[PDB]
């Protein structure tokens, strides 16, 4: 931010302030989610529906 200023050559109210801008960091971190669906080959053959499609 800015400030209001005097004009004095010697008093502390005649001096312009110093100041900082600052940056920070957010992150994407890739994480994994998964499942395994085991089925028996005979059950998959005897069913009336394609259980691998399901």
């Amino acid at each position: 931010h800015a400030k209001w200023v005097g004009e004095s050559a010697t008093a502390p109210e005649g001096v312009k302030p110093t100041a900082k801008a600052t940056w920070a960091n957010k992150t994407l971190v890739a994480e994994e989610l998964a499942v395994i669906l085991p089925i028996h080959e005979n059950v998959l053959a005897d069913a009336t529906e394609d259980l691998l499609a399901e």
Binding site: V5, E7, S8, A9, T10, G14, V15, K16
Partner: protein, 54 residues
């Protein structure tokens, strides 16, 4: 001047400026002028001093 520090005043920090004036000068007096075979002591200057009495 618009950024210097002069007499402890930081010019830029205080929205001040200064004018630095200078000149370089010399003086010489040609005062033992030649007067013959023998070197002489003189001056081209004489002085009048006020009446000291009371």
């Amino acid at each position: 001047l618009d950024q210097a520090t002069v007499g402890g005043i930081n010019l830029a920090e205080r929205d001040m400026v200064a004018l630095r004036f200078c000149g370089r000068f010399a003086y010489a007096l040609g005062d033992n002028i030649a007067q013959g075979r023998v070197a002489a002591e003189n001056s081209p200057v004489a002085v009048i001093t006020p009446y000291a009495g009371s």
